[PDB]
Amino acid sequence: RTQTGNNTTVNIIISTVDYLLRVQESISDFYWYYSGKDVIDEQGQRNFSKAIQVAKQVFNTLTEYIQGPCTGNQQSLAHSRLWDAVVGFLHVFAHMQMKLSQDSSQIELLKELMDLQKDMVVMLLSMLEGNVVNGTIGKQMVDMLVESSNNVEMILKFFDMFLKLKDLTSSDTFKEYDPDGKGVISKRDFHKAMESHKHYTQSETEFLLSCAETDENETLDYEEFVKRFHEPAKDIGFNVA
């Protein structure tokens, strides 16, 4: 951050944030390109993967900068342009989590993207390390959250839904719908089990049905379904909480 001995000092910590802001804008523009299109081709799915990997590495670098309660770097990031990058990634996550999850051909992209979300939340926690009551970093982060309230609301609804999925699958109704251990459960069976759950609204029901993938036998593997959707939901939700 500060080369004390040198005559001229360059803030590598802030240059990292500048590159993060540029790669965020690139990812956001590429998302805006693919949002209208129903399907993402192989080339686009590869470009997303490479960009997400780069952003993940940058987030890890920033986390390594700010951990070890390095207060100077914490304040530098707090007053830098990090907040715009984070608020853009929040929008990207909030909309891609509902776009990709519907289609079963971008599960790997969804995994990479929710890993990027985990790293961003980890960086936010590392910023919040060594906090004080009524701190400036807390003020900045709450202002960011207020700005991105809609995106965080959508993300939190997504996580609450896929965390209640576990209780739904642990319900006795589902246990008697699947007395045997195969678990390969029909689409209508899952739909009526959800209707019996009484914890899922109508819109939640259509979203689960859309995100639910079935074979030609019209029967679904709930074990793998709940794995894929619950486990990232669980860990990212824990970090957000």
Coordinates of N, CA and C in Angstrom, one line a residue:
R1 N 0.8 -1.2 0.0 CA 0.0 0.0 0.0 C 0.9 1.3 0.0
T2 N 1.9 1.3 0.9 CA 2.7 2.5 1.0 C 4.2 2.1 1.1
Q3 N 4.9 2.4 0.0 CA 6.4 2.2 0.0 C 7.0 3.4 0.7
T4 N 7.3 3.2 2.0 CA 7.8 4.3 2.8 C 9.1 4.8 2.4
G5 N 10.1 3.9 2.1 CA 11.4 4.4 1.8 C 11.5 5.0 0.4
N6 N 10.7 4.6 -0.5 CA 10.7 5.0 -1.9 C 10.3 6.5 -2.0
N7 N 10.8 7.2 -3.0 CA 10.4 8.6 -3.2 C 8.9 8.6 -3.7
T8 N 8.6 7.7 -4.6 CA 7.3 7.6 -5.2 C 6.6 6.3 -4.8
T9 N 5.3 6.4 -4.4 CA 4.6 5.3 -3.9 C 3.4 5.0 -4.9
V10 N 3.2 3.7 -5.2 CA 2.1 3.2 -6.0 C 1.3 2.3 -5.2
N11 N -0.1 2.6 -5.2 CA -1.0 1.8 -4.4 C -1.5 0.6 -5.2
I12 N -0.7 -0.5 -5.1 CA -1.1 -1.8 -5.7 C -2.4 -2.3 -5.2
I13 N -2.7 -2.0 -3.9 CA -4.0 -2.4 -3.3 C -5.2 -1.7 -4.1
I14 N -5.0 -0.5 -4.4 CA -6.1 0.2 -5.2 C -6.1 -0.2 -6.6
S15 N -4.9 -0.4 -7.2 CA -4.9 -0.9 -8.6 C -5.6 -2.2 -8.8
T16 N -5.5 -3.1 -7.7 CA -6.2 -4.4 -7.8 C -7.7 -4.1 -7.8
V17 N -8.2 -3.1 -7.0 CA -9.6 -2.8 -7.0 C -10.0 -2.2 -8.3
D18 N -9.2 -1.4 -9.0 CA -9.5 -0.9 -10.3 C -9.6 -2.0 -11.3
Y19 N -8.7 -3.0 -11.3 CA -8.9 -4.1 -12.2 C -10.2 -4.9 -11.9
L20 N -10.5 -5.1 -10.6 CA -11.7 -5.8 -10.3 C -12.9 -5.0 -10.8
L21 N -12.9 -3.7 -10.7 CA -14.0 -2.9 -11.3 C -14.1 -3.1 -12.8
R22 N -13.0 -3.1 -13.5 CA -13.0 -3.3 -14.9 C -13.5 -4.7 -15.3
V23 N -13.1 -5.8 -14.7 CA -13.5 -7.1 -15.0 C -15.0 -7.3 -14.6
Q24 N -15.5 -6.6 -13.5 CA -16.9 -6.7 -13.2 C -17.7 -6.0 -14.3
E25 N -17.3 -4.9 -14.9 CA -18.0 -4.3 -16.0 C -18.0 -5.2 -17.2
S26 N -16.9 -5.9 -17.5 CA -16.9 -6.8 -18.6 C -17.8 -7.9 -18.4
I27 N -17.9 -8.5 -17.2 CA -18.8 -9.6 -16.9 C -20.2 -9.2 -17.0
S28 N -20.5 -8.0 -16.5 CA -21.9 -7.4 -16.5 C -22.3 -7.2 -18.0
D29 N -21.5 -6.7 -18.8 CA -21.8 -6.4 -20.2 C -22.1 -7.8 -20.9
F30 N -21.2 -8.8 -20.6 CA -21.4 -10.0 -21.3 C -22.7 -10.7 -20.9
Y31 N -23.0 -10.6 -19.6 CA -24.3 -11.0 -19.1 C -25.5 -10.3 -19.8
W32 N -25.4 -9.0 -19.9 CA -26.4 -8.3 -20.6 C -26.6 -8.7 -22.0
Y33 N -25.5 -9.1 -22.7 CA -25.6 -9.7 -24.0 C -26.3 -11.0 -24.0
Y34 N -26.0 -11.9 -23.1 CA -26.6 -13.2 -23.1 C -28.0 -13.3 -22.4
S35 N -28.4 -12.2 -21.8 CA -29.7 -12.2 -21.0 C -30.9 -12.4 -21.9
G36 N -30.9 -11.7 -23.0 CA -32.0 -11.9 -24.0 C -32.0 -13.3 -24.6
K37 N -30.9 -13.8 -24.9 CA -30.8 -15.1 -25.5 C -31.2 -16.2 -24.5
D38 N -32.0 -17.2 -25.0 CA -32.5 -18.2 -24.1 C -31.4 -19.2 -23.7
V39 N -30.5 -19.5 -24.6 CA -29.5 -20.5 -24.4 C -28.1 -19.9 -24.6
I40 N -27.1 -20.3 -23.8 CA -25.8 -19.8 -23.9 C -25.0 -20.8 -24.6
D41 N -24.3 -20.4 -25.7 CA -23.5 -21.4 -26.5 C -22.2 -21.8 -25.8
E42 N -21.5 -22.7 -26.4 CA -20.3 -23.2 -25.7 C -19.3 -22.1 -25.6
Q43 N -19.1 -21.3 -26.6 CA -18.1 -20.2 -26.5 C -18.4 -19.2 -25.4
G44 N -19.7 -18.8 -25.3 CA -20.0 -17.9 -24.3 C -19.9 -18.6 -22.9
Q45 N -20.2 -19.9 -22.8 CA -20.1 -20.6 -21.5 C -18.6 -20.7 -21.1
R46 N -17.7 -20.9 -22.1 CA -16.3 -20.8 -21.8 C -15.8 -19.5 -21.4
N47 N -16.2 -18.4 -22.1 CA -15.8 -17.1 -21.7 C -16.2 -16.7 -20.3
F48 N -17.5 -17.0 -20.0 CA -17.9 -16.8 -18.6 C -17.0 -17.5 -17.6
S49 N -16.7 -18.8 -18.0 CA -15.8 -19.5 -17.0 C -14.5 -18.9 -16.8
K50 N -13.8 -18.4 -17.9 CA -12.5 -17.8 -17.8 C -12.6 -16.5 -17.0
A51 N -13.6 -15.7 -17.3 CA -13.8 -14.4 -16.6 C -14.1 -14.6 -15.1
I52 N -15.0 -15.6 -14.8 CA -15.3 -15.9 -13.4 C -14.0 -16.4 -12.7
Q53 N -13.2 -17.2 -13.3 CA -11.9 -17.6 -12.7 C -11.0 -16.4 -12.4
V54 N -10.9 -15.5 -13.4 CA -10.1 -14.3 -13.1 C -10.6 -13.5 -12.0
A55 N -12.0 -13.2 -12.0 CA -12.6 -12.5 -10.9 C -12.4 -13.2 -9.5
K56 N -12.5 -14.5 -9.5 CA -12.2 -15.2 -8.3 C -10.8 -15.0 -7.8
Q57 N -9.8 -15.1 -8.7 CA -8.5 -14.9 -8.3 C -8.3 -13.5 -7.7
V58 N -8.9 -12.5 -8.4 CA -8.7 -11.1 -7.9 C -9.4 -10.9 -6.5
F59 N -10.5 -11.6 -6.3 CA -11.2 -11.5 -5.0 C -10.3 -12.2 -3.9
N60 N -9.7 -13.3 -4.3 CA -8.8 -14.0 -3.3 C -7.6 -13.1 -3.0
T61 N -7.1 -12.4 -4.0 CA -5.9 -11.5 -3.8 C -6.3 -10.4 -2.8
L62 N -7.5 -9.8 -3.0 CA -8.0 -8.7 -2.1 C -8.2 -9.2 -0.7
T63 N -8.7 -10.4 -0.6 CA -8.9 -11.0 0.7 C -7.6 -11.2 1.4
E64 N -6.6 -11.7 0.7 CA -5.3 -11.8 1.3 C -4.7 -10.5 1.6
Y65 N -5.0 -9.4 0.9 CA -4.5 -8.1 1.2 C -5.1 -7.6 2.6
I66 N -6.4 -7.9 2.8 CA -7.1 -7.2 3.9 C -7.2 -8.1 5.1
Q67 N -6.9 -9.4 5.0 CA -6.9 -10.2 6.3 C -5.7 -9.8 7.2
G68 N -5.5 -10.5 8.3 CA -4.5 -10.1 9.3 C -4.8 -8.7 9.8
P69 N -6.1 -8.5 10.2 CA -6.6 -7.1 10.3 C -5.7 -6.0 9.9
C70 N -5.3 -6.0 8.6 CA -4.5 -4.9 8.1 C -5.4 -3.7 7.9
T71 N -5.4 -2.8 8.9 CA -6.4 -1.7 8.9 C -6.1 -0.7 7.8
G72 N -4.9 -0.5 7.4 CA -4.6 0.4 6.4 C -5.2 0.0 5.0
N73 N -5.0 -1.3 4.7 CA -5.6 -1.8 3.5 C -7.1 -1.9 3.6
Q74 N -7.6 -2.2 4.8 CA -9.1 -2.2 5.0 C -9.7 -0.8 4.7
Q75 N -9.1 0.2 5.2 CA -9.6 1.6 5.0 C -9.4 2.0 3.5
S76 N -8.3 1.6 2.9 CA -8.1 1.9 1.5 C -9.2 1.3 0.6
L77 N -9.5 0.0 0.9 CA -10.6 -0.6 0.1 C -11.9 0.1 0.5
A78 N -12.1 0.4 1.7 CA -13.4 1.0 2.1 C -13.6 2.3 1.4
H79 N -12.6 3.1 1.2 CA -12.7 4.4 0.4 C -12.5 4.2 -1.0
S80 N -12.1 3.1 -1.5 CA -11.9 2.8 -2.9 C -13.2 2.6 -3.7
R81 N -13.1 2.2 -4.9 CA -14.2 1.9 -5.8 C -14.7 0.4 -5.7
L82 N -14.3 -0.3 -4.6 CA -14.7 -1.6 -4.4 C -16.3 -1.8 -4.4
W83 N -16.9 -0.8 -3.8 CA -18.4 -0.9 -3.6 C -19.2 -1.0 -4.9
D84 N -18.8 -0.3 -6.0 CA -19.4 -0.4 -7.3 C -19.2 -1.8 -7.9
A85 N -18.0 -2.4 -7.8 CA -17.8 -3.7 -8.3 C -18.7 -4.7 -7.5
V86 N -18.7 -4.6 -6.2 CA -19.5 -5.6 -5.4 C -21.0 -5.4 -5.7
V87 N -21.5 -4.2 -5.9 CA -22.9 -4.0 -6.2 C -23.2 -4.4 -7.6
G88 N -22.3 -4.4 -8.5 CA -22.5 -5.0 -9.8 C -22.6 -6.5 -9.8
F89 N -21.6 -7.1 -9.1 CA -21.6 -8.6 -9.0 C -22.9 -9.0 -8.3
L90 N -23.4 -8.2 -7.4 CA -24.7 -8.6 -6.7 C -25.8 -8.7 -7.7
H91 N -25.9 -7.8 -8.6 CA -26.9 -7.8 -9.6 C -26.7 -9.0 -10.5
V92 N -25.5 -9.3 -10.9 CA -25.2 -10.4 -11.8 C -25.6 -11.7 -11.2
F93 N -25.2 -11.9 -9.9 CA -25.5 -13.1 -9.2 C -27.0 -13.2 -9.1
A94 N -27.7 -12.2 -8.7 CA -29.1 -12.3 -8.4 C -29.9 -12.7 -9.7
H95 N -29.5 -12.2 -10.8 CA -30.2 -12.6 -12.0 C -29.7 -13.9 -12.7
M96 N -28.4 -14.2 -12.7 CA -28.0 -15.5 -13.2 C -28.4 -16.7 -12.3
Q97 N -28.5 -16.5 -11.0 CA -29.0 -17.6 -10.2 C -30.4 -18.0 -10.5
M98 N -31.2 -17.1 -11.1 CA -32.6 -17.5 -11.5 C -32.6 -17.8 -13.0
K99 N -31.6 -17.4 -13.8 CA -31.6 -17.7 -15.2 C -31.0 -19.1 -15.5
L100 N -29.8 -19.3 -15.0 CA -29.1 -20.6 -15.3 C -29.8 -21.7 -14.6
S101 N -30.3 -21.6 -13.4 CA -30.8 -22.7 -12.6 C -32.0 -23.4 -13.3
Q102 N -32.7 -22.6 -14.1 CA -33.9 -23.2 -14.8 C -33.4 -24.2 -15.8
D103 N -32.3 -24.0 -16.5 CA -31.9 -24.8 -17.6 C -30.8 -25.8 -17.1
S104 N -30.8 -27.0 -17.5 CA -29.9 -28.0 -16.9 C -28.6 -28.1 -17.7
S105 N -28.4 -27.2 -18.7 CA -27.2 -27.3 -19.5 C -26.1 -26.3 -19.0
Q106 N -26.3 -25.6 -17.9 CA -25.3 -24.7 -17.4 C -25.0 -24.9 -15.9
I107 N -25.1 -26.2 -15.5 CA -24.9 -26.5 -14.1 C -23.4 -26.1 -13.7
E108 N -22.5 -26.4 -14.5 CA -21.1 -26.1 -14.2 C -20.9 -24.6 -14.1
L109 N -21.5 -23.8 -15.0 CA -21.4 -22.4 -15.0 C -22.1 -21.9 -13.7
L110 N -23.2 -22.5 -13.3 CA -23.8 -22.1 -12.0 C -22.9 -22.3 -10.8
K111 N -22.2 -23.5 -10.8 CA -21.2 -23.8 -9.8 C -20.1 -22.8 -9.7
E112 N -19.5 -22.5 -10.9 CA -18.4 -21.5 -10.9 C -18.9 -20.1 -10.4
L113 N -20.1 -19.7 -10.8 CA -20.7 -18.5 -10.4 C -21.0 -18.4 -8.9
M114 N -21.5 -19.4 -8.3 CA -21.8 -19.4 -6.9 C -20.5 -19.6 -6.1
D115 N -19.5 -20.1 -6.7 CA -18.1 -20.0 -6.0 C -17.6 -18.6 -6.0
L116 N -17.8 -17.9 -7.1 CA -17.4 -16.5 -7.1 C -18.2 -15.7 -6.0
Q117 N -19.5 -16.0 -5.9 CA -20.3 -15.4 -4.8 C -19.7 -15.7 -3.4
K118 N -19.3 -16.9 -3.2 CA -18.7 -17.3 -1.9 C -17.5 -16.5 -1.7
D119 N -16.6 -16.4 -2.7 CA -15.4 -15.6 -2.5 C -15.7 -14.1 -2.2
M120 N -16.7 -13.5 -2.9 CA -17.0 -12.1 -2.7 C -17.5 -11.9 -1.2
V121 N -18.3 -12.8 -0.7 CA -18.8 -12.7 0.6 C -17.7 -12.9 1.6
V122 N -16.7 -13.8 1.3 CA -15.6 -14.0 2.2 C -14.8 -12.7 2.2
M123 N -14.6 -12.0 1.1 CA -13.9 -10.8 1.1 C -14.6 -9.7 1.9
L124 N -15.9 -9.7 1.8 CA -16.7 -8.7 2.7 C -16.5 -9.0 4.2
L125 N -16.5 -10.3 4.5 CA -16.3 -10.6 5.9 C -14.9 -10.2 6.4
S126 N -13.9 -10.5 5.5 CA -12.5 -10.1 5.8 C -12.4 -8.5 6.0
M127 N -13.2 -7.8 5.2 CA -13.2 -6.3 5.4 C -13.8 -6.1 6.8
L128 N -14.8 -6.8 7.2 CA -15.5 -6.6 8.5 C -14.7 -7.1 9.7
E129 N -13.6 -7.8 9.4 CA -12.8 -8.2 10.6 C -12.3 -7.0 11.3
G130 N -12.2 -7.1 12.7 CA -11.7 -6.1 13.5 C -12.6 -4.8 13.5
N131 N -13.9 -5.0 13.4 CA -14.8 -3.9 13.3 C -15.0 -3.2 14.6
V132 N -15.5 -2.0 14.6 CA -15.8 -1.2 15.7 C -17.3 -0.7 15.6
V133 N -17.8 -0.4 16.8 CA -19.2 0.1 16.8 C -19.3 1.4 16.0
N134 N -20.3 1.5 15.1 CA -20.5 2.7 14.2 C -19.2 2.9 13.4
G135 N -18.7 1.9 12.8 CA -17.5 2.1 12.0 C -17.8 2.5 10.6
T136 N -16.8 3.2 10.0 CA -16.9 3.7 8.6 C -17.1 2.6 7.6
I137 N -16.3 1.5 7.8 CA -16.5 0.3 6.9 C -17.9 -0.2 7.0
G138 N -18.4 -0.3 8.2 CA -19.8 -0.8 8.3 C -20.8 0.2 7.6
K139 N -20.6 1.5 7.8 CA -21.4 2.4 7.1 C -21.4 2.2 5.6
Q140 N -20.2 2.1 5.0 CA -20.1 1.9 3.6 C -20.8 0.7 3.1
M141 N -20.6 -0.4 3.8 CA -21.1 -1.7 3.4 C -22.7 -1.7 3.6
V142 N -23.2 -1.1 4.6 CA -24.6 -1.0 4.7 C -25.2 -0.1 3.7
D143 N -24.5 1.0 3.3 CA -25.0 1.8 2.2 C -25.0 1.0 0.9
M144 N -24.0 0.1 0.6 CA -24.0 -0.8 -0.5 C -25.2 -1.7 -0.5
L145 N -25.4 -2.3 0.7 CA -26.5 -3.3 0.8 C -27.9 -2.6 0.5
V146 N -28.0 -1.4 1.0 CA -29.3 -0.6 0.8 C -29.4 -0.3 -0.7
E147 N -28.3 0.1 -1.4 CA -28.3 0.3 -2.8 C -28.8 -1.0 -3.5
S148 N -28.2 -2.1 -3.2 CA -28.5 -3.4 -3.9 C -29.6 -4.2 -3.2
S149 N -30.5 -3.6 -2.5 CA -31.5 -4.3 -1.7 C -32.3 -5.3 -2.5
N150 N -32.7 -4.9 -3.7 CA -33.5 -5.8 -4.6 C -32.7 -7.0 -4.9
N151 N -31.5 -6.9 -5.4 CA -30.7 -8.1 -5.7 C -30.5 -9.0 -4.5
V152 N -30.1 -8.4 -3.4 CA -29.9 -9.2 -2.2 C -31.2 -9.8 -1.8
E153 N -32.4 -9.1 -1.9 CA -33.6 -9.7 -1.6 C -33.9 -11.0 -2.5
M154 N -33.6 -10.9 -3.8 CA -33.8 -12.0 -4.7 C -32.9 -13.2 -4.3
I155 N -31.6 -12.9 -4.0 CA -30.7 -13.9 -3.6 C -31.1 -14.6 -2.4
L156 N -31.6 -13.8 -1.4 CA -32.0 -14.4 -0.1 C -33.3 -15.2 -0.3
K157 N -34.2 -14.8 -1.1 CA -35.3 -15.6 -1.4 C -34.9 -16.9 -2.0
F158 N -34.0 -16.9 -3.0 CA -33.5 -18.1 -3.6 C -32.9 -19.0 -2.5
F159 N -32.1 -18.5 -1.6 CA -31.4 -19.3 -0.6 C -32.4 -19.9 0.4
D160 N -33.4 -19.1 0.8 CA -34.4 -19.5 1.7 C -35.2 -20.7 1.1
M161 N -35.5 -20.5 -0.2 CA -36.3 -21.6 -0.9 C -35.5 -22.9 -1.0
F162 N -34.2 -22.8 -1.4 CA -33.5 -24.0 -1.5 C -32.9 -24.5 -0.2
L163 N -33.1 -23.8 0.9 CA -32.8 -24.3 2.2 C -34.1 -25.0 2.8
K164 N -35.3 -24.5 2.5 CA -36.5 -25.2 2.8 C -36.7 -26.4 2.0
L165 N -36.1 -26.5 0.9 CA -36.1 -27.8 0.1 C -35.6 -29.0 0.9
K166 N -34.6 -28.8 1.8 CA -34.2 -29.9 2.6 C -35.2 -30.3 3.6
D167 N -36.0 -29.4 4.2 CA -37.0 -29.8 5.1 C -38.2 -30.5 4.3
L168 N -38.5 -30.0 3.1 CA -39.4 -30.6 2.3 C -39.1 -32.1 2.0
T169 N -37.8 -32.3 1.6 CA -37.4 -33.7 1.3 C -37.3 -34.5 2.6
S170 N -37.1 -33.9 3.7 CA -37.1 -34.7 5.0 C -38.5 -34.9 5.6
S171 N -39.5 -34.3 4.9 CA -40.9 -34.4 5.4 C -41.3 -35.9 5.4
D172 N -42.2 -36.3 6.3 CA -42.7 -37.6 6.3 C -43.6 -37.9 5.1
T173 N -44.2 -36.9 4.5 CA -45.0 -37.1 3.3 C -44.0 -37.6 2.1
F174 N -42.9 -37.0 2.0 CA -41.9 -37.4 1.0 C -41.4 -38.8 1.3
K175 N -41.2 -39.1 2.6 CA -40.7 -40.4 3.1 C -41.6 -41.5 2.7
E176 N -43.0 -41.2 2.8 CA -43.9 -42.3 2.4 C -44.2 -42.3 0.9
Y177 N -43.9 -41.2 0.2 CA -43.9 -41.2 -1.2 C -42.7 -42.0 -1.8
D178 N -41.7 -42.1 -1.0 CA -40.5 -42.8 -1.4 C -40.2 -43.8 -0.3
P179 N -41.0 -44.9 -0.2 CA -40.7 -45.9 0.8 C -39.4 -46.6 0.5
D180 N -39.1 -46.9 -0.7 CA -37.8 -47.5 -1.1 C -36.7 -46.5 -1.3
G181 N -35.5 -47.0 -1.3 CA -34.3 -46.1 -1.4 C -33.9 -45.6 -2.7
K182 N -34.6 -46.0 -3.8 CA -34.1 -45.5 -5.1 C -34.1 -44.0 -5.2
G183 N -35.2 -43.3 -4.7 CA -35.2 -41.9 -4.7 C -35.6 -41.3 -6.0
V184 N -35.8 -42.1 -7.1 CA -36.1 -41.6 -8.4 C -37.6 -41.3 -8.5
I185 N -38.0 -40.1 -8.2 CA -39.3 -39.7 -7.9 C -39.9 -39.0 -9.0
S186 N -41.2 -39.3 -9.4 CA -41.9 -38.7 -10.5 C -42.1 -37.2 -10.3
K187 N -42.3 -36.5 -11.4 CA -42.5 -35.1 -11.4 C -43.8 -34.7 -10.7
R188 N -44.9 -35.4 -11.0 CA -46.2 -35.2 -10.4 C -46.1 -35.5 -8.9
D189 N -45.4 -36.6 -8.5 CA -45.2 -36.9 -7.1 C -44.5 -35.8 -6.4
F190 N -43.4 -35.2 -7.0 CA -42.7 -34.1 -6.3 C -43.6 -32.9 -6.2
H191 N -44.4 -32.6 -7.2 CA -45.3 -31.5 -7.2 C -46.3 -31.6 -6.1
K192 N -46.9 -32.8 -6.0 CA -48.0 -32.9 -4.9 C -47.3 -33.0 -3.6
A193 N -46.1 -33.5 -3.4 CA -45.4 -33.5 -2.2 C -45.2 -32.0 -1.8
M194 N -44.7 -31.2 -2.7 CA -44.5 -29.8 -2.4 C -45.8 -29.1 -2.0
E195 N -46.9 -29.4 -2.7 CA -48.2 -28.9 -2.4 C -48.6 -29.3 -1.0
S196 N -48.3 -30.5 -0.6 CA -48.6 -31.0 0.8 C -47.7 -30.3 1.8
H197 N -46.5 -29.9 1.4 CA -45.5 -29.3 2.4 C -46.1 -28.1 3.1
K198 N -47.0 -27.3 2.4 CA -47.7 -26.1 3.0 C -46.7 -25.0 3.3
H199 N -45.4 -25.2 3.2 CA -44.4 -24.1 3.4 C -44.0 -23.5 2.1
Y200 N -44.5 -23.9 0.9 CA -44.1 -23.4 -0.4 C -45.3 -22.7 -1.0
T201 N -45.1 -21.5 -1.4 CA -46.1 -20.8 -2.1 C -46.2 -21.3 -3.6
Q202 N -47.2 -20.7 -4.3 CA -47.4 -21.1 -5.7 C -46.2 -20.8 -6.5
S203 N -45.7 -19.6 -6.5 CA -44.6 -19.2 -7.3 C -43.3 -20.0 -7.0
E204 N -43.1 -20.2 -5.7 CA -42.0 -21.1 -5.3 C -42.2 -22.5 -5.9
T205 N -43.5 -23.0 -6.0 CA -43.7 -24.3 -6.6 C -43.3 -24.3 -8.1
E206 N -43.7 -23.3 -8.9 CA -43.3 -23.3 -10.3 C -41.8 -23.2 -10.4
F207 N -41.2 -22.4 -9.6 CA -39.7 -22.2 -9.7 C -39.0 -23.6 -9.4
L208 N -39.5 -24.3 -8.3 CA -38.9 -25.6 -8.1 C -39.1 -26.5 -9.2
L209 N -40.3 -26.5 -9.8 CA -40.6 -27.5 -10.9 C -39.8 -27.1 -12.1
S210 N -39.6 -25.8 -12.4 CA -38.7 -25.4 -13.5 C -37.3 -25.8 -13.3
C211 N -36.7 -25.6 -12.1 CA -35.4 -25.9 -11.8 C -35.2 -27.4 -11.7
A212 N -36.2 -28.2 -11.5 CA -36.2 -29.6 -11.3 C -36.0 -30.3 -12.7
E213 N -35.0 -31.1 -12.8 CA -34.7 -31.8 -14.0 C -35.1 -33.3 -13.9
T214 N -35.7 -33.8 -15.0 CA -36.2 -35.2 -15.0 C -35.7 -35.9 -16.2
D215 N -35.7 -37.2 -16.1 CA -35.3 -38.1 -17.3 C -36.5 -38.3 -18.2
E216 N -36.4 -39.2 -19.1 CA -37.5 -39.6 -20.0 C -38.6 -40.3 -19.2
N217 N -38.2 -40.9 -18.0 CA -39.1 -41.7 -17.2 C -40.0 -40.8 -16.4
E218 N -39.9 -39.5 -16.5 CA -40.6 -38.4 -15.8 C -40.4 -38.5 -14.3
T219 N -39.3 -39.1 -13.9 CA -38.9 -39.3 -12.5 C -37.6 -38.7 -12.2
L220 N -37.5 -38.1 -11.0 CA -36.4 -37.2 -10.7 C -35.5 -37.7 -9.6
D221 N -34.2 -37.5 -9.6 CA -33.3 -37.9 -8.6 C -33.2 -36.8 -7.5
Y222 N -34.0 -36.9 -6.5 CA -34.0 -35.8 -5.5 C -32.7 -35.7 -4.7
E223 N -32.0 -36.8 -4.6 CA -30.7 -36.7 -3.9 C -29.8 -35.7 -4.6
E224 N -29.6 -35.9 -5.9 CA -28.7 -35.1 -6.6 C -29.2 -33.7 -6.8
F225 N -30.6 -33.6 -6.9 CA -31.2 -32.3 -7.0 C -30.9 -31.4 -5.8
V226 N -31.2 -32.0 -4.6 CA -31.1 -31.2 -3.3 C -29.6 -31.0 -3.1
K227 N -28.7 -32.0 -3.4 CA -27.3 -31.7 -3.3 C -26.9 -30.5 -4.1
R228 N -27.1 -30.5 -5.4 CA -26.7 -29.4 -6.2 C -27.2 -28.0 -5.7
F229 N -28.5 -28.0 -5.3 CA -29.1 -26.7 -5.0 C -28.9 -26.3 -3.6
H230 N -29.0 -27.2 -2.6 CA -28.9 -27.0 -1.2 C -27.5 -26.6 -0.7
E231 N -26.5 -27.4 -1.2 CA -25.2 -27.3 -0.5 C -24.6 -25.9 -0.8
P232 N -24.5 -25.4 -2.0 CA -24.1 -24.0 -2.2 C -25.0 -23.0 -1.5
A233 N -26.3 -23.3 -1.5 CA -27.2 -22.4 -0.8 C -26.9 -22.4 0.7
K234 N -26.6 -23.6 1.3 CA -26.2 -23.7 2.7 C -25.0 -22.8 3.0
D235 N -23.9 -23.1 2.3 CA -22.6 -22.4 2.7 C -22.6 -20.9 2.4
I236 N -23.1 -20.5 1.2 CA -23.2 -19.1 0.9 C -24.2 -18.4 1.8
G237 N -25.3 -19.1 2.2 CA -26.2 -18.5 3.1 C -25.6 -18.3 4.5
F238 N -24.8 -19.3 4.9 CA -24.1 -19.1 6.2 C -23.2 -17.9 6.2
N239 N -22.4 -17.8 5.2 CA -21.6 -16.6 5.1 C -22.3 -15.3 5.1
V240 N -23.4 -15.3 4.3 CA -24.3 -14.1 4.3 C -24.9 -13.8 5.7
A241 N -25.3 -14.8 6.4 CA -25.9 -14.6 7.7 C -24.8 -14.1 8.7

